[PDB]
Amino acid sequence: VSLMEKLKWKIKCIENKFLNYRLTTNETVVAETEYGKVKGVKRLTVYDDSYYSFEGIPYAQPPVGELRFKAPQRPTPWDGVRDCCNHKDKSVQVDFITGKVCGSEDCLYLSVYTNNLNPETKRPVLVYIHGGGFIIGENHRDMYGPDYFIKKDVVLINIQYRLGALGFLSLNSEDLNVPGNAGLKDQVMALRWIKNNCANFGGNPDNITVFGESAGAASTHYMMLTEQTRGLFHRGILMSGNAICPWANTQCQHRAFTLAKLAGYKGEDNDKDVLEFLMKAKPQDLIKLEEKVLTLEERTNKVMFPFGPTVEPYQTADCVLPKHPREMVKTAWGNSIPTMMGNTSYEGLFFTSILKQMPLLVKELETCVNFVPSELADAERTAPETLEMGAKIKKAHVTGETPTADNFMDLCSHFYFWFPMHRLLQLRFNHTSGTPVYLYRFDFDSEDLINPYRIMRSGRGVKGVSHTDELTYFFWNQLAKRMPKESREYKTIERMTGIWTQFATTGNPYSNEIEGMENVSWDPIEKSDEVYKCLNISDELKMIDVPEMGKIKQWESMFEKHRDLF
């Protein structure tokens, strides 16, 4: 990231500190939790609203020393008042602006926000799980400020969970008790805390919605799949992702050795010795070196991250993913709660930054074999079957003689987001009670209000609605500002937080108290539907046939002779 954006960020970081101070009040309050009393503080927003804030609430033991790489443990209770008027540190990770490692192993916290601690009726509970490829992210308010949501009468909760190898190392040797998915197991224990405590904050424990974007969408889906959380929550929103996206899980059991070797380990490839090295290594050294773990073969086959959600190789008490995600959908308790899913209108427009450093990637579309789903393609991607599937992809996205960057970003929309959504819907239909699933398409483009991901994807002065562009209308961030109430941006904040809270409350996302939904008839998808219908959210709210459908079906045709893999 450029020197200019670095300094620009530095200055906004400085602005955010002083703004955060100014927006604080002397009104502190104490709430009960099953672990002891917590002290929160009332804060202001730039729209002259206010909300009670409890930050740094521990839902697990600090996962340090011998707890590193391990499943989380319930925290120790205290008798006194825990100071929750300040935020705790984020999971150890690379900062995308600076490039330096930041964070701490002591990161297992959640935050609780609400405009009214003593409501007259128990409120819908919304739980946000942040994205960031399972390698970055946080519940700090400079990125995920509850300021828009607290206009509504809900309880909003933002969690943290372990990222990268500290979150997702996985070892085969059953004796060592590092099966994997610790970071997902963090998510589970936070859910259980939320179930058992949200009542103390005005929250209704029988009406909980979990939602997340990107890796947070995949996480939300995982929380809907695992037996570990059955009956814990009641609605789910999958924003730009799910657990059968190709980036959303990986078999990373061999990659521990590589990371150790990168970090200075001398010795042999056996799990025990590898673990002992990794256990004593400095957490920043491990995280700094994660970028380098993936082989050129893996990157070629579109493996995106070295460490992430995985099929655990043996079953333990806290096991989260005992089979591949596609297999888990077939038995998922979450299949039978109200679900909402959706994507932006140009998801793949995110990849512009990466394309600029690697122009050669556009030549991949000449045959498109690298984008054939791994499970269908051969090792070298040279088999005649593979060229044939690759051709079906090429016909779907390449528009002229020679492939363009827009062709590429369009393909990525489907490779990473639309096609997995299609596979999940169809798979889910075969194993469900018949609870509704609703589809939305976020199609609102503005440069007047933005979020920090636009810095990452080099999205300055780029038209179209990229992956993460919708976060701007859900959460306050340190790049935001007060928008006039009549502005198209402010209206969309109302609409988005409105629909989300409407869906959280009733399991039905439609309301005629939302401006612009007067002629909206928002139907759920049926298994009989050849064509998906979605609410398309632009300046106007319009129900349409999913525009990506035709390409969606072209991708499906790759499985013509392999329907059982679909």
Which amino acid is it at 180?
Answer: G
How many Cα atoms sit within 13 Å of 372 on the Cβ side? 25
Instruction: Tell me how far apart the alpha carbons of residues 121 and 313 are, in angstroms, rounded to a whole number.
Output: 46
**Is 264 exposed, middle or buried, given 0-12, 13-18 or 19+ CB atoms closer than 10 A?**
exposed
CA distance 376 to 203: 46
Q: Which residues pair with residue 422 across a beta bridge?
A: none
The DSSP symbol for 113 reads E
Q: What are residue 521's phi and psi, to 5 degrees?
A: -115, 90
Q: Left if phi > 0, otherwise alpha if psi is -120 to 50, otherwise beta: which for 314?
A: beta
Q: Amino acid identity of 188?
A: V
Q: Which two tokens stand for residue 232?
A: 């814990």
Question: What are the helix and strand counts (H, E) for the chain?
Answer: 16, 15
Question: β-pairing, 36-44 with 24-33?
Answer: antiparallel
Q: Which two tokens stand for residue 297?
A: 């073969």
| 61: its two tokens | 């033991």
| DSSP-derived secondary structure for 280-333 | HS-HHHHHHHGGG-S-HHHHHTT---SS-----SS--TT---SS-HHHHHTT-G
Residue 116 CA to residue 168 CA, distance in Å, equals 37
| 190 neighbors 216 (Cβ within 8 angstroms) | no
Cβ density class 108-135: b for 16+ within 10 Å, e for less: bbbbbbbbebebeebbbbbbbbbbbbbb
180 sits in the region (left: phi over 0; alpha: psi -120 to 50; else beta) called: left
Instruction: Tell me how far apart the alpha carbons of residues 520 and 464 are, in angstroms, rounded to a whole number.
Output: 24
Task: Tell me the C-alpha distance between 525 and 341, whole Å.
Answer: 11
Query: What is the sign, positive or negative, of the torsion defined by CA atoms of 390, 391, 392, 395?
Result: positive
Structure tokens at 99: 């490039």
Q: Choose among 250, 255, 292, 249: nearest CA to 274.
A: 255
Tokens 């096609």 sit at which residue? 419
- SS3 sequence, 18-62? HHHHHCEEEEEEEEEECCEEEEEEEEECCCCCEEEEEEEEECCCC
Angle, helix 384-397 to helix 405-413, in steps of 10 degrees = 100
H-only helix segments in 414-462: 419-429, 453-456
Phi/psi for 228 (5° steps) reads -65, -25
Domain extent, residue 547, equals 1-566
What is the residue type of 220?
T
Judge whether 195 and 125 are in contact, CB under 8 Å.
no
Which residues is 208 bridged to in the sheet?
125
Residues sharing a CB contact under 8 Å with residue 151, sequence separation 6 or more, in sequence order? 47, 49, 115, 497
Contact 173, 276 (CB under 8 A): no
Residue 57: closest CA among 121, 154, 127: 127
Residue 30's φ and ψ, nearest 5 degrees, are: -120, 130
DSSP annotation string for 402-418: S--HHHHHHHHHIIIII
| CA atoms of 131 and 217, how far apart (whole Å) | 7
- Cβ neighbors of 355 (< 8 A, separation 6 or more) are 361, 362, 405, 408, 409
For residue 431, what are the contacts with CB-CB under 8 A and spacing of at least 6?
329, 330, 331, 332, 335
C-alpha to C-alpha distance for 161 and 60, rounded to whole angstroms: 10
3-state DSSP of 210-266: EEEECHHHHHHHHHHHCHHHCCCCCEEEEECCCCCCCCCCCCCCCHHHHHHHHCCCC
What tokens does 271 get? 């799990």
How far apart (Å, rounded) are the C-alpha atoms in residues 386 and 376? 8
Residue type for position 462 = V
In Å, how far are 98, 326, 363, 376, 449 from 564, measured between CA atoms? Answer: 46, 11, 31, 11, 45
Based on its alpha-carbon atoms, the radius of gyration of the chain, rounded to whole angstroms, reads: 23
Q: Tell me, rounded to whole angstroms, the distance of Cα 343 from its chain centroid.
A: 13
Positions annotated as catalytic residues are 214, 347, 467
Q: In whole angstroms, what separates CA 326 from the centre of its chain?
A: 18
The CATH number of the domain holding residue 1 is: 3.40.50.1820
Q: What SS3 class is residue 186?
A: helix
Asked whether 25 and 43 are in contact (CB, 8 A), the reply is: yes
How many whole angstroms separate alpha carbon 160 and alpha carbon 203? 20
β-strand pairing of 203-213 with 235-239: parallel
476-499 per-residue burial string, b: 16 or more CB within 10 A, e: under 16 = bbbbbeebeeeeebbbbbbbbbbb
Residue corresponding to tokens 């673990």? 275
Q: How was this structure determined?
A: X-ray
Structurally, the chain folds into a number of domains equal to 1
- What span, in angstroms and rounded, lies between the C-alpha atoms of 216 and 209? 13
Task: Please report, for residues 354, 375, 520, 527, 564, the alpha-carbon distance to residue 430 in angstroms, rounded to integers and kept in the order given.
Answer: 38, 21, 28, 8, 13
CA–chain centroid gap for 395, Å, is: 31
Cα-based angle 237, 186, 478 (whole degrees, multiple of 5): 60
| Measured torsion, CA atoms of residues 388, 393, 394, 400, in degrees rounded to the nearest 10 | 150
Query: Phi, psi (5° rounding) for residue 373?
Result: -50, 135
- List beta partners, residue 30: 39
Which tokens is 184 given? 């997902």
Single-letter amino acid code for the residue at 173: S
Residues near 155 by beta carbon (within 8 Å), at least 6 away in sequence: 112, 113, 114, 123, 124, 125, 126, 198, 201, 202, 203
CA distances, 88 to each of 68, 105, 196, 555 (Å): 18, 11, 22, 44
